[PDB]
Amino acid sequence: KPSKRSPIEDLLFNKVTAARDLICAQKFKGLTV
Amino acid sequence: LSFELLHAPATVCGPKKSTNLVKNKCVNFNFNGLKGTGVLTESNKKFLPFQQFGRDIADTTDAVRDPQTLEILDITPCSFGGVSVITPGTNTSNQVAVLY
Amino acid sequence: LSFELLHAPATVCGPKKSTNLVKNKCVNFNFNGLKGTGVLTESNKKFLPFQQFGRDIADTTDAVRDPQTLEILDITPCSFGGVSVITPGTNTSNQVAVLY
Amino acid sequence: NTLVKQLSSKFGAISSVLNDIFSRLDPPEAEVQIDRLITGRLQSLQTYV
Amino acid sequence: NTLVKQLSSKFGAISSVLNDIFSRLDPPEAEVQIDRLITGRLQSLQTYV
Amino acid sequence: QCVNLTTRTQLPPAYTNSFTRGVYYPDKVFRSSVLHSTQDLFLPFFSNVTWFHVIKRFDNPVLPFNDGVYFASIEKSNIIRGWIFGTTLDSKTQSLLIVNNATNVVIKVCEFQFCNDPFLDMESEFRVYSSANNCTFEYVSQPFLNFKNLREFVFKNIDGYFKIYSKHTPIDLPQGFSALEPLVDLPIGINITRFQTLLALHRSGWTAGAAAYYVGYLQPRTFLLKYNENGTITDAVDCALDPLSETKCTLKSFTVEKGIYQTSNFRVQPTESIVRFPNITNLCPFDEVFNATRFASVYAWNRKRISNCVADYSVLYNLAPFFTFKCYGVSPTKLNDLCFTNVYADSFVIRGDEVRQIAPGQTGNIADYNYKLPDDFTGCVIAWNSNKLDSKVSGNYNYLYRLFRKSNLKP
Numbered sequence: 196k197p198s199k200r201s202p203i204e205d206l207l208f209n210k211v212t213a214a215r216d217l218i219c220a221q222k223f224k225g226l227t228v
Numbered sequence: 229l230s231f232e233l234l235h236a237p238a239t240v241c242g243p244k245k246s247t248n249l250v251k252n253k254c255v256n257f258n259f260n261g262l263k264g265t266g267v268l269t270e271s272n273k274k275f276l277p278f279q280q281f282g283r284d285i286a287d288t289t290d291a292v293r294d295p296q297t298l299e300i301l302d303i304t305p306c307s308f309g310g311v312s313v314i315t316p317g318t319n320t321s322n323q324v325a326v327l328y
Numbered sequence: 329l330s331f332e333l334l335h336a337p338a339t340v341c342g343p344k345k346s347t348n349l350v351k352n353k354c355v356n357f358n359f360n361g362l363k364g365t366g367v368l369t370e371s372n373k374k375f376l377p378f379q380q381f382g383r384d385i386a387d388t389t390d391a392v393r394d395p396q397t398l399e400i401l402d403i404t405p406c407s408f409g410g411v412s413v414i415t416p417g418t419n420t421s422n423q424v425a426v427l428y
Numbered sequence: 429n430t431l432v433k434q435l436s437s438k439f440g441a442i443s444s445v446l447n448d449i450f451s452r453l454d455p456p457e458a459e460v461q462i463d464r465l466i467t468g469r470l471q472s473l474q475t476y477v
Numbered sequence: 478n479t480l481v482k483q484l485s486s487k488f489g490a491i492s493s494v495l496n497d498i499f500s501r502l503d504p505p506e507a508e509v510q511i512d513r514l515i516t517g518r519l520q521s522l523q524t525y526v
Numbered sequence: 527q528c529v530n531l532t533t534r535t536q537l538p539p540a541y542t543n544s545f546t547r548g549v550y551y552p553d554k555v556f557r558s559s560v561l562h563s564t565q566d567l568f569l570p571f572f573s574n575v576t577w578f579h580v581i582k583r584f585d586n587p588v589l590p591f592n593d594g595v596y597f598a599s600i601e602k603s604n605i606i607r608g609w610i611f612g613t614t615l616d617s618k619t620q621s622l623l624i625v626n627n628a629t630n631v632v633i634k635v636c637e638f639q640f641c642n643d644p645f646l647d648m649e650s651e652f653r654v655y656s657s658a659n660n661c662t663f664e665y666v667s668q669p670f671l672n673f674k675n676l677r678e679f680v681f682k683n684i685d686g687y688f689k690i691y692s693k694h695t696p697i698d699l700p701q702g703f704s705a706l707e708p709l710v711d712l713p714i715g716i717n718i719t720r721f722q723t724l725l726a727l728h729r730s731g732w733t734a735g736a737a738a739y740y741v742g743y744l745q746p747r748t749f750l751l752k753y754n755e756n757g758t759i760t761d762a763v764d765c766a767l768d769p770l771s772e773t774k775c776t777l778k779s780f781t782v783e784k785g786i787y788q789t790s791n792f793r794v795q796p797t798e799s800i801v802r803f804p805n806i807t808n809l810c811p812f813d814e815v816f817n818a819t820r821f822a823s824v825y826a827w828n829r830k831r832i833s834n835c836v837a838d839y840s841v842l843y844n845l846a847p848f849f850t851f852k853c854y855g856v857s858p859t860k861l862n863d864l865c866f867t868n869v870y871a872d873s874f875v876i877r878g879d880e881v882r883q884i885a886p887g888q889t890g891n892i893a894d895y896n897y898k899l900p901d902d903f904t905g906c907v908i909a910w911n912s913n914k915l916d917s918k919v920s921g922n923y924n925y926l927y928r929l930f931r932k933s934n935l936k937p
């Protein structure tokens with residue numbers, strides 16, 4: 196994998212999770228990340 | 229010709245106004261008395277025939293339909309954000325860098 | 329004599345009654361319509377002509393100008409503080425002490 | 429989400445939208461309405477912080 | 478410093494000085510500005526605490 | 527009575543750079559070693575202001591008075607005499623005049639007549655006005671007056687108060703800093719859209735000394751002022767120019783350490799707007815009322831009710847030439863931007879002399895027994911000739927009109 200990550204780390208990343216995304220909606224109200 | 233005013237919606241009046249639409253630019257707009265500001269883009273969403281406006285999960289307007297022609301227009305708030313200045317000690321120099 | 333009132337500054341009345349100034353005493357005073365309270369003392373500040381009343385870092389009146397002798401008087405709030413009471417249990421003894 | 433939803437609350441005013449408040453009547457009461465709205469929004473912001 | 482700066486804010490009232498408010502306004506309808514100032518100062522103190 | 531000199535060599539005005547000058551004491555409060563932030567009218571730093579030089583060479587154009595005046599002069603021998611604030615430069619409108627004597631200064635507000643070139647000319651002659659008009663406000667004060675003279679003034683009129691702040695510096699513009707201290711406040715309160723100045727020259731032709739001046743305009747800005755151990759403003763920073771000054775204002779300090787600091791936000795400021803509305807669509811025909819095949823008599827005229835219509839009142843001037851068209855309540859200046867409840871159309875035919883009778887508060891047989899109009903009637907009345915259509919050689923007895931009735935008719 197190009198990410199240079201172990202299978203355990205990849206699985207941990209995967210488990211954790213037209214139309215506008217909620218992040219964009221929050222961004223469009225003066226709230227940035 | 230005599231005009232009357234009663235307790236009624238009073239929907240007797242001629243043409244309001246008309247103008248041409250420009251896309252991909254930040255601009256104000258007023259559709260059917262609904263005011264807004266943003267950039268207009270072609271919308272791929274398929275609105276139902278009776279539906280005019282559109283709201284996202286944030287309960288804010290994100291789509292609109294042209295009253296003159298049955299075309300769906302996507303509105304997007306114009307770009308904005310804070311600014312920052314990166315500088316060394318003033319005793320060292322005076323040049324600064326600007327980050328958007 | 330004719331009296332009128334219009335949309336004008338209306339600056340024709342003359343100064344009203346005035347009294348004598350008392351220093352080194354915590355009193356309440358009026359200076360050109362400005363109310364204050366404290367102790368008046370001699371001021372060592374270099375009050376240049378047009379400077380009437382000074383201010384400190386806390387944004388409050390520190391010195392005033394007397395519009396009868398053109399003298400600058402420092403104002404200081406009079407003595408104040410907090411009182412603390414030291415006492416044992418009431419079921420043990422009734423003697424108390426205080427600390428200012 | 430909460431910090432967004434409080435934007436849709438009247439907070440005792442006529443409506444959440446503010447420009448309609450300005451255009452509806454004269455300032456002598458629109459000022460009070462805007463004062464109520466901004467006080468509520470500032471309280472929400474302070475709570476969020 | 479912040480608390481000191483909170484003494485220079487009108488919170489939407491007419492002035493930050495009590496004597497001017499009491500002298501230039503009729504006291505029955507001048508209570509609103511004083512109450513607004515008191516509420517603002519109490520809120521600032523609570524935030525500081 | 528004045529003189530015009532033909533030795534004028536026209537030259538375009540020059541622009542010089544004001545670096546840091548143009549800062550005054552905001553008010554009468556004493557501060558000591560405190561960095562204070564103020565938001566008021568000030569001359570922006572590094573401003574691009576005008577240059578006027580006379581030394582043949584002579585030109586004193588008139589400049590606007592948008593918001594305020596900052597006047598500067600490097601000078602010797604006191605060539606400049608005074609100033610004029612005149613919006614029209616004649617004896618019609620009010621003007622204001624400041625004159626510096628050899629041992630006095632006089633300030634006045636009234637009107638005078640100015641020649642094609644008013645100025646002052648040992649010097650025992652003085653010709654700047656040719657009219658003796660009455661004046662309202664006047665006052666007399668103690669006079670204000672290699673290169674050794676540097677005088678700078680500021681004039682601002684706001685809140686019904688006009689301010690006179692002046693200062694002198696002993697010695698393009700020098701790269702230095704100075705404090706401008708207040709002198710006078712006045713209750714004048716006049717608009718002033720333009721202003722002039724004065725100067726003194728000695729006849730040789732004529733001889734002009736080293737006279738030059740600069741004029742700048744004030745803007746609302748935020749400044750940070752650093753008071754020294756005394757009440758002297760030794761430094762000022764304007765933070766609407768470059769990001770470094772913005773960081774200085776944010777930190778409220780004259781020194782910034784290494785790092786990244788947030789100052790402000792960013793916006794787009796969109797251009798123009800969209801006022802799009804739907805089609806007109808439903809247009810109930812007004813032609814059936816105006817261009818009907820026939821009309822009715824004034825006693826039983828034709829009535830039509832109009833509701834839920836998109837009625838265009840612009841397209842009406844496409845018939846017989848021109849005739850009676852009088853509107854009451856609503857002006858004929860395209861008042862279609864007002865959506866009403868209902869429209870009532872009353873169409874009839876009357877003779878020429880009875881046209882005026884169809885109006886509120888009119889006396890006549892038609893106005894009473896045929897058609898009565900209320901005083902509070904809102905709308906319009908249109909009347910056009912119809913001789914070519916309603917008239918026949920043998921006569922047209924179809925149309926009738928009522929002549930007798932027991933009582934008048936309600937509107």
Ligand SMILES: *[C@@H]1O[C@H](CO)[C@@H](O[C@@H]2O[C@H](CO)[C@@H](O)[C@H](O)[C@H]2NC(C)=O)[C@H](O)[C@H]1NC(C)=O
Nearest residue numbers: 623625626627628629630631632634652655666
């Ligand atoms: C200061 O200068 C003014 C301006 O010239 C002098 O006012 C003139 O006085 C003479 C004689 O008194 C009059 O004939 C003129 O009509 C005046 N002109 C104006 C414009 O006022 C004044 O006399 C000078 N000396 C002072 C004020 O002491």
Ligand SMILES: *[C@@H]1O[C@H](CO)[C@@H](O[C@@H]2O[C@H](CO)[C@@H](O)[C@H](O)[C@H]2NC(C)=O)[C@H](O)[C@H]1NC(C)=O
Nearest residue numbers: 372373374375558753754755756757758759760
């Ligand atoms: C602030 O004011 C004081 C007093 O006027 C100034 O101190 C004097 O400065 C002059 C010029 O340097 C000296 O000749 C005097 O001897 C000083 N007086 C004393 C008592 O020391 C001081 O310089 C001023 N601060 C400035 C101008 O920045």
Ligand SMILES: *[C@@H]1O[C@H](CO)[C@@H](O[C@@H]2O[C@H](CO)[C@@H](O)[C@H](O)[C@H]2NC(C)=O)[C@H](O)[C@H]1NC(C)=O
Nearest residue numbers: 246294295296297298299803804805806807808
């Ligand atoms: C709204 O009016 C416009 C007027 O231009 C209409 O646009 C044209 O209308 C003609 C008939 O009036 C048609 O033949 C064209 O095909 C139309 N062109 C376009 C690009 O639409 C428009 O159709 C009208 N819309 C509605 C809903 O009435």
Ligand SMILES: *[C@@H]1O[C@H](CO)[C@@H](O)[C@H](O)[C@H]1NC(C)=O
Nearest residue numbers: 540541542543572573574575
């Ligand atoms: C000021 O105006 C002059 C007029 O010629 C011009 O040359 C100069 O570039 C201007 N300065 C700035 C900073 O724009």
Ligand SMILES: *[C@@H]1O[C@H](CO)[C@@H](O)[C@H](O)[C@H]1NC(C)=O
Nearest residue numbers: 528529530531640641642643
């Ligand atoms: C000088 O100019 C004025 C205009 O203000 C004019 O009336 C006058 O005639 C001129 N003088 C001569 C000698 O033409």
